[PDB]
Structure 1
Amino acid sequence: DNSYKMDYPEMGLCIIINNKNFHKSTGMTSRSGTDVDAANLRETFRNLKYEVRNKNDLTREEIVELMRDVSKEDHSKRSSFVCVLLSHGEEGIIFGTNGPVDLKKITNFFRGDRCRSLTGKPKLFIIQACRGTELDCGIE
């Protein structure tokens, strides 16, 4: 089979984590424009027939608990899974409102042996976040 089976009863979940405002202890700027992103994504994946869930300003503890909880749902009738992370970041890292969390910790919940009702189904992670502090000056 060359193409994923996308005709389950449901396309699947689209979890959108929209972190705009961060604790002063983090020194991180408020992410003006991210509400526009979150609304754009909600409408885009609605039109693709995903069950969209928007979450705003989650701590790193809340991000992990949300992902754990979602990975423990029964996805048997779902074709796929989508997670969108909008936040500050570093290489391998996404920020909760109060500090960093390893991306691997989030995605590990959905491993083929740990989320059996998504085994063999596409698991899509869309990550708007920095991955370091390098700048690309471009070439004319």
Structure 2
Amino acid sequence: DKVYQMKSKPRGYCLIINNHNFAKAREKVPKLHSIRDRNGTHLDAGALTTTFEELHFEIKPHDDCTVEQIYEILKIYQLMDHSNMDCFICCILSHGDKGIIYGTDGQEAPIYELTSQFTGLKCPSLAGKPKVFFIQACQGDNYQKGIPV
């Protein structure tokens, strides 16, 4: 089968947006008056760092980002030259809701708004190359029920 070229060293960048402190959200957004900080999230950032460095990616961590700050970070990588890279990874660790993720300030960022910044037209140097996004967040407040098997 055809396989994506994956031999560059580093393979490419692995962004890690790690949101822990939601004090701004609790104070600014009424319905988020009781949203709690994401204790333990650093364990995820550390695991991702170790895992992808082992896989030859260059890790770029960013902690506690508001929505505006997230878009700024993505713009920087959208405009960056990935010509010598074979892949691009972006990991988002935060709170979320249906189809969105929350910035530390409680503002919403549509998932599509995040991934669309790296399409072939917007980031030509990544055209034809795999763009991987891992999103760790709720996508609603419903508990997924179980079924016996």
Quickly name the TM-score band, shorter chain normalised: over 0.9
Q: RMSD in angstroms over aligned alpha carbons?
A: 1.2
Cross-structure match for 2:116: 108
**Separation in 1, partners of 2:10, 2:56:** 8
TM-score, length basis structure 1: 0.95
**Separation in 2, partners of 1:134, 1:51:** 36
Q: Is the 8 A contact 2:9 2:56 kept in 1?
A: no
**Separation in 2, partners of 1:18, 1:119:** 27
Cross-structure match for 1:118: 126
Figure out how many residues of one structure are paired with residues of the other and give that number.
140
**Separation in 2, partners of 1:10, 1:51:** 6
1:11 equivalent to 2:11? Answer: yes
Task: Determine helix, strand or coil for the equivalent of 2:11.
Answer: strand
TM-score, length basis structure 2: 0.89
Q: Cα distance, 1:90 vs. partner?
A: 1.1
Q: Cα distance, 1:91 vs. partner?
A: 1.9
1:60 equivalent to 2:43? Answer: no
Which runs of 5 or more structure 1 residues have no equivalent in the other structure? none
When you count helix as a share of all residues, which structure comes out higher? 2
**Separation in 2, partners of 1:108, 1:62:** 17
Task: Determine helix, strand or coil for the equivalent of 1:108.
Answer: helix
Which deviates more, 20-29 or 43-52?
20-29
Cross-structure match for 2:97: 90
**Separation in 1, partners of 2:36, 2:67:** 17
**Separation in 2, partners of 1:29, 1:79:** 38
**Separation in 2, partners of 1:92, 1:36:** 25
Q: Cα distance, 1:10 vs. partner?
A: 2.7
Q: Is the 8 A contact 2:91 2:135 kept in 1?
A: yes
Task: Determine helix, strand or coil for the equivalent of 1:139.
Answer: strand
Task: Determine helix, strand or coil for the equivalent of 1:78.
Answer: coil
Letter in 2 for 1:29: R
Cross-structure match for 2:20: 20
Which runs of 5 or more structure 2 residues have no equivalent in the other structure? none
Q: Percent identity?
A: 41
When you count strand as a share of all residues, which structure comes out higher? 1
Q: Cα distance, 1:138 vs. partner?
A: 0.9
Which deviates more, 61-70 or 21-30?
21-30
